[PDB]
Write a protein that binds this ligand. Structure first.
Ligand SMILES: CCCCCC/C=C/C=C/C/C=C/C/C=C/CCCC(=O)O[C@H](COC(=O)CCCCCCCCCCCCCCCCC)COP(=O)(O)O[C@@H]1[C@H](O)[C@H](OP(=O)(O)O)[C@@H](O)[C@H](OP(=O)(O)O)[C@H]1O
Ligand SMILES: CCCCCC/C=C/C=C/C/C=C/C/C=C/CCCC(=O)O[C@H](COC(=O)CCCCCCCCCCCCCCCCC)COP(=O)(O)O[C@@H]1[C@H](O)[C@H](OP(=O)(O)O)[C@@H](O)[C@H](OP(=O)(O)O)[C@H]1O
Ligand SMILES: CC(C)CCC[C@@H](C)[C@H]1CC[C@H]2[C@@H]3CC=C4C[C@@H](O)CC[C@]4(C)[C@H]3CC[C@]12C
Ligand SMILES: CC(C)CCC[C@@H](C)[C@H]1CC[C@H]2[C@@H]3CC=C4C[C@@H](O)CC[C@]4(C)[C@H]3CC[C@]12C
Ligand SMILES: CC(C)CCC[C@@H](C)[C@H]1CC[C@H]2[C@@H]3CC=C4C[C@@H](O)CC[C@]4(C)[C@H]3CC[C@]12C
Ligand SMILES: CC(C)CCC[C@@H](C)[C@H]1CC[C@H]2[C@@H]3CC=C4C[C@@H](O)CC[C@]4(C)[C@H]3CC[C@]12C
Ligand SMILES: [Cl-]
Ligand SMILES: [Cl-]
Ligand SMILES: [Cl-]
Ligand SMILES: [Cl-]
Lengths: 708, 120, 708, 120
């Protein structure tokens, strides 16, 4: 065929049927030449193993990048607190790792690590030291945020945000050139570490998926099968997303489930195993780099009791209640950024948000602590070996009020800041903030339950289930349940979320609680809206995304969505013969239609095929270059084989999808979703009457939603 | 390396003596309560009880990996900053891709920041 | 509409589009009446929660039945060995559970448990005692097999076989009335225990899915939404299958993955969480009954080393090599049962197979031991506490030859007997025999590797990876890898299998080995055929199953598959008007067509709709009963509103799927698979030319396969 | 119940004394090496080492559940066998369902055993 045929412009949807046709044609061509020569056999073998090789490379790259990002973020987050002069490349934990000056009260206290006050003022303690630590923390947060936003803006503007919504749109057939490119990969890799160091209310777990999605895309250029076909490239992208989730949470099964449930519009059977293998390889790479078998390991000796489900369900009620609120809040803010004037100053907005976050976080120990480290601490149980402040009250009698107040203040601060942090022009993840909020809520609930059980053990439930004066209630489990509930409420993921939490915890004994909590949260979220945060952002950005939930009215019919309608003039049509190249070029230039139907005759209106505008222009230009005399006067004939008429039957889709005008849109939407059609041709009495494009369906659904 | 490995252990407060920490660089077989704790405050009859109460762990870290990752990340960040400075100050087949990417980045920067709305 | 419209005959495929249309119409009707009255609101609330209630009931029933089946099978399997006179209801382990006469050498030795020789002959040891034990074991196996086969034949002979192939066919839209009924449920529940007790080379894990699939079906009759719609019922069946796998292996995540990957042709997003919840509930029920947190718990202290992957891959080579062989062997036998004369005597065949199995199994201790118990023993590591014969050699120096010979004999016996056991007319599972074969192979490989490492520690690989004179090699892990490889080779499941094995083991540190082994096995199996054992049995039974793997030739077009063709007369067509009821009845009786197209006129051949034969006859009979004077002379008009003409527009599909004759079958198959169409109407120039039914596609694919 | 619970340990062969088993009915707090093993063959200085070498586990079983499940399964099997015998010997809205099921099972039994090929 003519070079460039079958390609698409930026910000356009792909035709899955045509992609499958091209893939099958290429497979036939490759397999036909296998017997021709040994080199052809080797090429065919490479083509067969192209999927395995690309998934392996994507997993390796994702694991390496995740390990590097984690290590760099851990190293930089402690630069705000102080510096290790002896080894500038060691964070607070690593600098104090091998020091014998440690103390039981302070595990990370050793003379090697010097706080900024000691570096400049020269005193480790005192009002001046505290003031200088405050100022240096603020300055470092501002510097990191400014560097991240500047790098995002200058080099890869697409690196901002989690990227899960855009990945969801892309995997549905949308095209965003440069989103999954090398520049975006590098810039997001650097800026994720920078933003996590800045201390903003965001995470690097969810965004890592984008990183993975980038790597595979790049690797898709090393294999012609996946470089030339968009559907195969999107399958590779789904595998990359699974690997990214796996490295983010160390949950290969959870990553595969997330890919299947959230981001993959189409998930063939082979993609399941390919994604699983890629995720496993990436997890192996991370385990061979980062450790220096679970991240949020927990040890709840007491098995969870049945009555504890009731508090857990309560956490679910919270998890949804915040979730929906966030969806109502963040979007309300994000839309404002797209409508008000503060969106014209992204760098200033990021700097101000970082300033506020650091200023309000430094005074409170929980907020100052890293969000991932805060979740780690909240997930641990209280015991004689531990010396966390949260457990102080337990050691005092068995201040609880002070700890509860601090936790509540941290929860309020994180809830308020996550709304203003998500959507800014830096790589921002929603998993870590939501998990931290839910963990704080669950820790508070568990502390309350423990206090009730200890002080009121006379109650029949506690006495029967719990031995008097026993540590049956584990606040760590409550924090885990709260984190899972909040994540489910904000994202609405149900099975992938539970499996990811279980893998990131390693505890299979708490599957039933988590699930239940998640369920509750989801339902509560669905009470205030069935759209998740990612889907809400997709709608806000106006991406052409079609979801199974969206449905049309029963009365609506195909005739009500046909493009020609009444006011619009007759839809562009190409005659089979007796038509000049100049006419085709003029029609292409005049109209923005993605494609044009072809009819036997203007009066007959008997359908022949569909000619895409891009293919039309590419073929016309290539024919003009190759063959002399094509000056626009030569006629163009689409019929099967002096003027040397141009032959355009190759670029013609001889089997355009056709539906009847009386067919309800209820079935048209189902056809579009299942088959991934880009356009359908509504016919009546065997002739062409109109065209219904995926854009028309999306516009109708958006209008109906706006009316609501 | 002596920095890569350690063996440390933590004892909770037993009777009069409060909880304490003891670390030293030994191999796995040497890492134990009696060897690590020297001297041990607890009396003779309670020595073993203290050992059970205390928890000793031997750990190993890859300092070289952290070193290399930090160094490469810092070099990449510095190169990116220098290239940015050259772009904003000095600039006013590889080259062709470079200007094509410059036009592309101008486009996407207009799309993401100036408008925030690429609806297609 | 007329009562009975929308139903299907036995052994027919459902139209998924029509089922979705009916479901949406019912949803509209239910939601429209919500404001009418409070009782309507309660009915709507019940309808909304119908899915949750049905999945909960299915999970509870599946868990209870799985626990009962497991306990009964465990109790009966030991009846062959002996009896506990003091408590006839205790197996060998339970009878000896609280006895102080136990010994270290014999854990289950106590005077309470009496072997049949002691009961009759009166001596626990001696040639006569051994002979009598042999005879009684054979007699009990024969009695159990005869009772199982007789119960299957008399009451619910659909209970034979695993049922996974038939479940796969049903979930694709096929209808088998009585397969998932109450009679089948009860008979399979009893006969699974009976067959497992008989000692035949089969399992009760895979077949349990059928049990679950039955329960939900019954519960689907308690909810109108799922009782009236076939697609919703099939979603409930998918959830039931997930719960069944969960109870079989205690793997709710594994059960969901198996449902998604193997048995569910269509798996909506909601079905994922519904199946997960049902599986979790069923697992909870099983954990609340059977224990009296993992079944095949293992303790491999030494972490798996990288070089151990190479032996594991070898096991994969075995796993596939046997797998394909079994697919080639069992089918070859099964086809013979359908072609030779020994299939006319199912009871005799079952009795003979049981006789041979018992006779050859009793002499060898491993074969005599229960297959599940054999897998349990093989999965354990060797240590000072254990006293298994397999580890005797390790205690002797550190007879290995005797243990290896016994394991090889057991492997050969199981491999030979599984071919002749699968397919007989009793509930037979393939998971347990395949896992046992793979476990024996892996145990042999691990013993060989341990011997090589100990005797030849000078080798650089062993010396570097393993400390000299250390138990680094764990034969239990090798047995687990071999079992996983064999199961993957025989079933070709990739991710669901790995997750099921991990959950049934509880060890997350061995995910990478298992996966790799599975991959190898699958590939090796794919080298000798891409069809699994379940798909092979589906093809053997001739069920109308369409799979994504099957594809047509490029040259093939729709015109080559249209029903009318050339030799066949013109396809039946109904005129819009001027047509009598007698003509319609005569056409219905004469032709076996599932449906008839409707045209405006005979000459015009302008399509109007599609009238299903069942709906046609039901409507005609109902109209005759309701309205007097319909004696066949009255004309039938399908057009929109003295003879009182019958109105049949309600039963007419006003939007029958239409394709062009030039459209390649490559796209027709994709449309049929994605949309689950039951028929398509091939048209040319806007008129009706032919009909392509799913039966035609299946027949063409079967013919092409037969030619190969 | 005394039958439901038990506590037993197994000791591997230590020096001269071979491995041994000891079981008794006690509570969890009583279940330990010293209490369960009485007398213990090992000498005075090796008593503690023997305790580490040995492993005592406290277990509980639900005898009532196994009782009930076995009883109900046996009753169901006996009822099924009696109904079968009645069908083959005695027989030659509930009744209507019974005869409809009889016809259905006859037809589907013909499909399964007689032919094995119910292709549609
Ligand atoms: C340690 C710390 C961790 C760091 C993380 C490392 C992993 C990152 C991968 C390395 C990539 C490197 C980035 C090269 C830019 C690129 O190579 O950028 C292409 C434009 O020239 C150029 O080299 C411009 C280079 C100007 C100077 C470079 C200075 C160097 C900076 C200092 C640090 C570098 C160290 C990295 C080592 C690793 C344009 O390529 P792109 O960036 O891919 O953007 C579009 C997209 O790929 C579309 O893809 P899609 O449709 O699938 O979405 C295509 O279709 C379009 O193709 P077109 O050119 O025909 O329009 C294409 O432009
Ligand atoms: C403890 C040990 C563990 C045991 C396991 C317990 C769980 C099992 C569930 C209990 C079911 C019980 C089985 C009742 C037969 C049934 O009730 O059988 C229907 C035919 O009359 C009859 O009662 C005949 C009853 C003659 C005497 C019964 C003696 C009793 C025997 C002694 C033991 C009983 C104890 C069980 C307690 C639990 C026909 O019903 P079916 O068995 O459902 O077969 C067809 C299918 O359901 C299609 O479904 P599909 O299209 O979805 O595939 C429908 O559509 C067709 O409907 P149609 O009648 O209009 O043709 C339908 O016949
Ligand atoms: C083209 C892309 C996919 C290649 C990416 C290769 C990456 C994954 C490779 C390059 C260098 C590798 C590392 C090199 C050395 C070691 C030390 C060893 O004790 C564990 C593995 C580990 C930590 C490797 C992990 C994988 C690694 C990071
Ligand atoms: C944006 C990111 C990548 C930049 C990170 C650079 C950091 C690590 C640099 C910037 C300024 C540096 C400090 C500048 C001056 C001194 C004084 C010297 O006697 C010891 C090192 C010390 C204390 C440096 C430590 C490292 C330091 C904090
Ligand atoms: C209509 C169908 C779905 C109902 C099925 C209900 C089943 C699942 C119910 C009925 C009786 C129940 C059991 C009754 C008593 C006990 C003892 C308790 O210590 C643990 C739960 C356990 C073991 C229950 C498990 C669930 C159970 C088996
Ligand atoms: C097909 C299945 C369900 C039938 C199971 C019934 C079994 C358990 C029955 C059948 C025959 C029975 C035996 C028949 C006779 C005796 C002698 C008596 O002094 C003690 C019980 C004893 C030893 C019985 C034990 C239980 C027994 C083995
Ligand atoms: Cl995140
Ligand atoms: Cl995110
Ligand atoms: Cl099985
Ligand atoms: Cl099976």
């Amino acid at each position: 065929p003519i070079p460039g045929v079958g390609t698409y412009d930026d910000f356009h949807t792909i035709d899955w049927v045509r992609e499958k046709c091209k893939d099958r044609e290429r497979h036939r061509r490759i397999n036909s030449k296998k017997k021709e020569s040994a080199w052809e056999m080797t090429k065919s073998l490479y083509d067969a193993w192209s999927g395995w090789l690309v998934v392996t490379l994507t997993g390796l790259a994702s694991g390496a990048l995740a390990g590097l990002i984690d290590i760099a973020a851990d190293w930089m987050t402690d630069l705000k607190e102080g510096i290790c002069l002896s080894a500038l490349w060691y964070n607070h934990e690593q600098c104090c790792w091998g020091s014998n000056e440690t103390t039981f009260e302070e595990r990370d206290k050793c003379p090697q690590w010097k706080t900024w006050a000691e570096l400049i003022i020269g005193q480790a303690e005192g009002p001046g030291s505290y003031i200088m630590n405050y100022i240096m923390y603020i300055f470092w947060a501002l510097s990191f945020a400014f560097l991240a936003v500047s790098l995002v803006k200058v080099f890869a503007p697409y690196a901002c945000g989690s990227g899960i919504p855009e990945i969801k749109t892309i995997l549905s057939g949308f095209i965003i050139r440069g989103y999954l490119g090398k520049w975006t990969l590098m810039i997001k890799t650097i800026t994720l570490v920078l933003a996590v160091a800045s201390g903003l209310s965001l995470g690097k777990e969810g965004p890592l998926v984008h990183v993975a999605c980038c790597c595979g895309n790049i690797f898709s250029y090393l294999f012609p099968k996946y470089s030339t076909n968009e559907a195969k490239k999107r399958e590779v992208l789904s595998a990359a997303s699974a690997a990214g989730v796996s490295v983010a949470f160390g949950a290969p099964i959870g990553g595969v489930l997330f890919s299947l449930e959230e981001v993959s519009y189409y998930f063939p059977l082979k993609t399941l195993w390919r994604s699983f293998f890629a995720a496993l390889v990436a997890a192996f790479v991370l385990r061979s780099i980062n450790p220096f078998l679970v991240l949020f390991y927990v040890e709840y000796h007491t098995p969870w009791y049945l009555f504890e489900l009731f508090p857990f369900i309560l956490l679910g009620v919270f998890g949804g209640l915040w979730g929906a609120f966030f969806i109502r809040a963040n979007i309300a803010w994000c839309r404002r950024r797209k409508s008000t004037k503060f969106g014209k100053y992204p760098v200033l907005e990021v700097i101000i948000v970082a300033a506020i976050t650091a200023v309000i976080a430094f005074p409170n120990p929980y907020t100052r602590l890293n969000t991932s480290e805060l979740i780690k601490e909240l997930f641990t149980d209280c015991g004689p070996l531990e010396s966390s402040s949260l457990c102080d009250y337990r050691n005092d009698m068995n201040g609880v009020y002070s700890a509860i107040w601090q936790l509540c203040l941290a929860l309020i601060f994180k809830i308020i800041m996550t709304v203003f942090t998500f959507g800014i022009k830096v790589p921002s993840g929603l998993f870590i903030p939501s998990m931290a909020i839910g963990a704080i809520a669950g820790r508070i609930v568990g502390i309350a339950v423990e206090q009730l059980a200890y002080y009121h053990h006379d109650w029949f439930i506690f006495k029967e289930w719990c031995e008097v004066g026993a540590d049956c209630i584990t606040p760590g489990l409550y924090a885990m349940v709260g984190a899972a509930a909040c994540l489910g409420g904000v994202t609405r993921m149900t099975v992938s979320l539970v499996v990811i939490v279980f893998e990131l915890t390693g505890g299979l004994e708490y599957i039933v609680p988590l699930m239940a909590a998640v369920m509750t949260s989801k339902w509560v979220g669905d009470a205030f809206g069935r759209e998740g945060i990612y889907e809400a952002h997709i709608r806000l950005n106006g991406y052409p995304f079609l979801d199974a939930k969206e449905e049309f009215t029963h009365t609506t019919l195909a005739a009500d969505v046909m493009r020609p309608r009444r006011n619009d003039p007759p839809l562009a049509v190409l005659t089979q013969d007796n038509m000049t190249v100049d006419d085709i070029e003029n029609m292409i230039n005049e109209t923005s239609y993605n494609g044009f139907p072809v009819i036997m005759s203007k009066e007959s209106q008997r359908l022949v095929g569909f000619a895409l505008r891009r293919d039309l222009t590419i073929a016309i230009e290539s024919a003009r270059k190759k063959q002399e005399g094509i000056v626009g006067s030569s006629r163009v004939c689409f019929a099967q084989h002096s003027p040397r008429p141009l032959k355009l039957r190759s670029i013609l889709d001889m089997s355009p999808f056709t539906v009847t005008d009386h067919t309800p849109m209820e079935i048209v939407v189902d056809i579009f979703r299942k088959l991934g059609l880009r356009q359908c041709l509504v016919t009546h009495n065997g002739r062409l009457l109109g065209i219904i494009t995926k854009k028309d369906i999306l516009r109708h659904m958006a209008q109906t939603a706006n009316q609501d | 390396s002596s920095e890569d490995i350690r063996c440390k252990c933590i004892c909770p407060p037993y009777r009069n003596i409060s909880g304490h920490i003891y670390n030293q660089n030994v191999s796995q077989k040497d890492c134990n309560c009696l060897h690590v704790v020297e001297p041990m405050p607890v009396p003779g009859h309670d020595v073993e009880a203290y050992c059970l109460l205390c928890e000793c762990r031997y750990e190993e870290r890859s300092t070289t990996t952290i070193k290399v990752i930090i160094v490469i990340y810092l070099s990449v960040v510095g190169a990116l900053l220098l290239y940015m400075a050259f772009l904003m100050l000095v600039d006013p087949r590889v080259e062709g891709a470079q200007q094509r990417w410059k036009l592309q980045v101008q486009e996407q920067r207009k799309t993401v920041f100036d408008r925030h709305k690429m609806l297609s």
